[PDB]
Amino acid sequence: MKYMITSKGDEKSDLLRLNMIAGFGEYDMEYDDVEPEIVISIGGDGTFLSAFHQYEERLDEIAFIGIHTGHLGFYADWRPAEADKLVKLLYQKVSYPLLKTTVKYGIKEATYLALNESTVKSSGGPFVVDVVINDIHFERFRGDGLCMSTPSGTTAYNKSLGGALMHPSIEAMQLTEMASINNRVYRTIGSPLVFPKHHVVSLQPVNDKDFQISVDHLSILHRDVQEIRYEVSAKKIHFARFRSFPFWRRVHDSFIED
Template identity: 60%
Template sequence: MKFAITSKGDAKSNALMHKMRTYLKDFNLEYDEKEPEIVISVGGDGTLLYAFHRYSSRLSKTAFVGVHTGHLGFYADWVPDEIEKLVIAIAKTPYQIIEYPLMEAIIRYKNGGRETRYLALNESTVKSVDGTLVMDVEIRGQHFEVFRGDGLCLSTPSGSTAYNKALGGAIIHPSLPSIQLAEMASINNRVFRTVGSPLIMPAHHTCMLKPVNRSDFMITIDHLTLVHKDVKSIQYRVADEKIRFARFRPFPFWKRVHDSFIDG
């Protein structure tokens, strides 16, 4: 089996990365950063997000597993004291593949023809470069509302526990292929009105954002932040691709929610 390891970059994570790499090679596994069958993320959820985007072109061939060296992560279910156990499991045990839905974002521009496509594991946010964000929101090709406020956040089910939760969004189990739209400080008065609640859309629904008075936006895709100019529209939907996690033991989603937010 071919494997690769990504590290958060701190001394503790780097030491674990080198130790695991040595152990796995001792089991005759091949280290291959270009075409790994399994990618081990050592750090936290941010490290796994980085690994996901690095290998997003081969999601159907690569599975991910996380070791967290800090706080409990939603994607990292192993701790440093268990790396010998994890190494033996990787080398000797057939693993279960668990798939989580991803979100596709397509940004189209006013000059026509050109577009940029991204995949998000957690979320995408849209804010105006300056001033209030004003966006026409369309769902399934039908106008839904005009949003005015600080910004909008669209998230995946696995990302629903991140920024989306801080915005008052619902926590969605990742077995449900869906995307969620949450508002950031919307303006609601006698003149301007939004639904004011998070919206959860199924896999066959598309959410389209169309600029009203500006065309330059600060758009995030997970940890990546870029300014996009002359934007015509931003389209979101559940992606055809999925992320694959290698599971060597149960890692129940609701237990992670409980341990992270209630009694970890």
């Protein structure tokens, strides 16, 4: 099948990439980074997130595999010493949900797809937004920002903000607060919120309309913003799996002991 390999760029990941290509040259495999069937990421989670956004236009034709040259990553869960055994076996596919973000401007829409999370923060001044859940006004948020996480992203920024860890078989999204103000006049829910499919969470500005909006590792300053809509995407990321590595085991090895 057609395949490609991306590398972290350091000495360890580049030469591991060249050896897998050589191993692939001994089979019916064509290296094609335009229309690959298999995308192998050699490096860390940030290297994997880059590989995902590289091919976000062909998600339903691609199965991703991650090899962790540094420590263990949640998306890169193959060790380098198991690379040759990986070449040979190259199985079943597993799918994780994704988050769809829509940004509307006063006076052309822009949509984005997130594998970890999308966050909103102020352009420098204070951050005030109204939070609207399915056209019903839920709260007015004053604080540092908000974070909307996929299931597989709940172990990332979401986890540092007090959010729950969520098994990736649950099609959902989770909203966490970043340092909300709560006193006699300002009031937020103060708990993470977990939304199912077809629920739309909208963020609407109260005064300032410039926001720093992130999607995974990308962060862009958006101006003249009127609304930011979140919902569980209809698209999914597909992984190539060759052995049982359960999510809760991977959580254990990354946070408890390994």
